[PDB]
Amino acid sequence: GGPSVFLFPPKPKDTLMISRTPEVTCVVVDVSQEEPDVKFNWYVDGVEVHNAQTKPREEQFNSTYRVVSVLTVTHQDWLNGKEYTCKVSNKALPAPRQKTVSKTKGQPREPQVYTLPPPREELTKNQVSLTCLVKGFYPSDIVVEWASNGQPENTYKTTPPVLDSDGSYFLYSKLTVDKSRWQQGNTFSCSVMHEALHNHYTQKSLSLS
């Protein structure tokens, strides 16, 4: 039971947000200490690449080694459907262990986004919750965030994706705001980024009417 390889995809935030840089990460574990120097080979649609940043053999608590390599991807390359292979070689193993990862397959379904105001029985309280329903999207990789009067917010929570009755997912975002600022005529904005949208972004608005 020697080396074990695990390949992880980039984070949806990174793939969807232009200014970021998404990464694909190869993790080798249980590298035992007789022969602990491991060599990485990276392939993109079967073409070798060499621009990954391989880390040095970190130690572990179970007196095993854990080596990591990070390959930079370009946004459109990941969302075009290319496939990323990590082939890992170590002196103590029969034939190099390999793993591939690529974008979740299935025909992309675009999310419908809706904004829900506070219920009637919540106005008695000091703070009110605005709701953002995001439903009908596939794949499940999604980013949702709020912003009020042009500039961001931090005070919000988003449920994990929930599989719906028809192979699509949905989620809810919640934003706690002060009833004073809600009923004094301020606009809030729910914004979602997902691969199937126009410019990978759309946003709905909410404001007392």
Ligand X SMILES: *[C@@H]1O[C@H](CO[C@@H]2O[C@@H](C)[C@@H](O)[C@@H](O)[C@@H]2O)[C@@H](O[C@@H]2O[C@H](CO)[C@@H](O[C@@H]3O[C@H](CO[C@H]4O[C@H](CO)[C@@H](O)[C@H](O)[C@@H]4O[C@@H]4O[C@H](CO)[C@@H](O)[C@H](O)[C@H]4NC(C)=O)[C@@H](O)[C@H](O[C@H]4O[C@H](CO)[C@@H](O)[C@H](O)[C@@H]4O[C@@H]4O[C@H](CO)[C@@H](O)[C@H](O)[C@H]4NC(C)=O)[C@@H]3O)[C@H](O)[C@H]2NC(C)=O)[C@H](O)[C@H]1NC(C)=O
- Binds 6, which of a second copy, ligand X, none (CB < 5 to 8 A, cut-off by type)? ligand X
Q: Nearest to residue 98, comparing CAs of 110, 89, 107?
A: 89
Q: What b-and-e string marks burial along 193-203, b requiring 16 or more CB atoms within 10 Å of the CB?
A: bbbebeebebb
Element (H, E) at 29: strand 23-31
Q: C-beta of 11: minimal distance to a second copy in Å?
A: 19
- Binds 4, which of a second copy, ligand X, none (CB < 5 to 8 A, cut-off by type)? ligand X
> In the chain, count of helices (H) and strands (E)?
3, 18
Which range, of 59-67, 80-88, 141-149, 191-199, touches ligand X by CB under 6 A? 59-67
Residues 6+ apart with CB under 8 A from 45: 82, 83
**Contact indicator for 191, 147 with CB cutoff of 8 Å:** yes
- Binds 21, which of a second copy, ligand X, none (CB < 5 to 8 A, cut-off by type)? none
- Binds 62, which of ligand X, a second copy, none (CB < 5 to 8 A, cut-off by type)? ligand X
The only residue of 81, 114, 149, 152 in contact with a second copy, by rule CB under 8 A: 114
| Contact set with ligand X (CB under 6 A) | 4, 6, 8, 11, 25, 27, 29-30, 60, 62, 64, 66
